[PDB]
């Protein structure tokens, strides 16, 4: 047996892939949705875990977003699966609430969370606009979409998701290549102490602090 491309997790501290639990850091924590019927009118809002808040986004024109409220979300915390209807209808593609799920050999499906009655709270999470504000990574695991924290998320910071090589077309194009296996050049995360951003180096963090907070 051989794990499939979407059987791996990524440890945000090691910055590398693992199966089941990280040899250095142990098993990741998966947060459970508050349980509610797959069918109620407001299921999505009610599936929200304690500690998070749906409310007006900090991104102009975004509408609603999801905010961290109670306490720090540790680094490498997992949410999901993203819920919705599975479909091959390309109309889903850019409908604002759908993710691509790849099945190998350039085949794809979508999980569509547009309908609040069959989706979960993750439908309200807005996409990051840049690397500095992104604090969640959407990635495929067991043919399903999960979000992991790529930062310590402090109280009052908006949850903002984006994606990379563990998702969609990039994932689909490398499928079967064992590239995750071969990774097992470490990216750096340098968070700002005064706002919700983080930077890829100390230089960039200092320039930011000096333009935005203190010089
Ligand atoms: Zn680790
Ligand atoms: Zn800042």
**Dihedral sign, Cα of residue 90, residue 92, residue 95, residue 97:** negative
106 labelled ligand-binding: no
**Residue in the structure block whose two tokens are 């984006």:** 162
Q: What is the resolution of this structure in A?
A: 2.2
Residue count of the chain, please give it: 215
48 labelled ligand-binding: no
68 labelled ligand-binding: no
Contacts of 170 (CB under 8 A, 6+ apart): 164
Contacts of 1 (CB under 8 A, 6+ apart): none
40 labelled ligand-binding: no
Contact 163, 125 (CB under 8 A): no
Dist. CA 199 → ligand 2 center (Å): 10
211/215 Cα distance (integer angstroms): 7
Dist. CA 195 → ligand 2 center (Å): 4
Dist. CA 96 → ligand 2 center (Å): 28
Question: Solved by what technique?
Answer: X-ray
Longest dimension (CA), the chain: 57
151/76 Cα distance (integer angstroms): 8
Q: Which ligand is nearest to the CA of 26?
A: 1
113 labelled ligand-binding: no
Dist. CA 164 → ligand 1 center (Å): 19
Q: Which ligand is nearest to the CA of 194?
A: 2
Q: Which of 144, 156, 211, 151 is nearest to 187 (CA)?
A: 151
Q: Which ligand is nearest to the CA of 132?
A: 2
| HEC letters along the chain | CCCCHHHCEEECCCCEEECCCECCCECCCEECCCCCCCCCCCHHHHCCCCCEEEEECCCCCCCEEEEECCCCECCCCEECCCCCEEECCHHHCCCCCEEEEECCCCCEEEEECCCCCCCCHHHHCEECCCCCCCCEEEEEECCEEEEEECCCECCCCECEEECCCCCHHHHHHCCCCCHHHHHCCCCCCEECCCCCCEECCHHHHHHHHHHHCCC
Contact 132, 157 (CB under 8 A): no
Looking at the DSSP bridge assignments, the partners of residue 65 are: 55
**Residue in the structure block whose two tokens are 């440890």:** 11
- Cα end-to-end span (Å), the chain: 57
Q: What structural domains and CATH numbers belong to the chain? A: 1-183 (2.170.270.10), 185-215 (3.30.160.60)
């Amino acid at each position: 047996s051989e794990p499939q491309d979407d059987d791996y997790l990524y440890c945000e501290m090691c910055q590398n892939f693992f199966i089941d639990s990280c040899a250095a850091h142990g098993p990741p924590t998966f947060v459970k949705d508050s349980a509610v019927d797959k069918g109620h009118p407001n299921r999505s809002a009610l599936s929200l875990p304690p500690g998070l808040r749906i409310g007006p986004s900090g991104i102009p024109q975004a509408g609603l977003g999801v905010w961290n409220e109670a306490s720090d979300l540790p680094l490498g915390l997992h949410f999901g699966p993203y819920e919705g209807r599975i479909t091959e209808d390309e109309e889903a593609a850019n409908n604002g609430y759908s993710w691509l799920i790849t099945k190998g050999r350039n085949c794809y499906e979508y999980v569509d969370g547009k309908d609040k009655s069959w989706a979960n709270w993750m439908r309200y999470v807005n996409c990051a606009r840049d690397d500095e504000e992104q604090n969640l990574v959407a990635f495929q695991y067991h043919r399903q979409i999960f979000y992991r924290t790529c930062r310590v998320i402090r109280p009052g910071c908006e949850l903002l998701v984006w994606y990379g090589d563990e998702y969609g077309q990039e994932l689909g194009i490398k499928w079967g290549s064992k590239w995750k296996k071969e990774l097992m050049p470490k990216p750096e995360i340098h968070p700002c102490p005064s706002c919700c951003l983080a930077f890829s180096s100390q230089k960039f963090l200092s320039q930011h602090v000096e333009r935005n907070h203190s010089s």
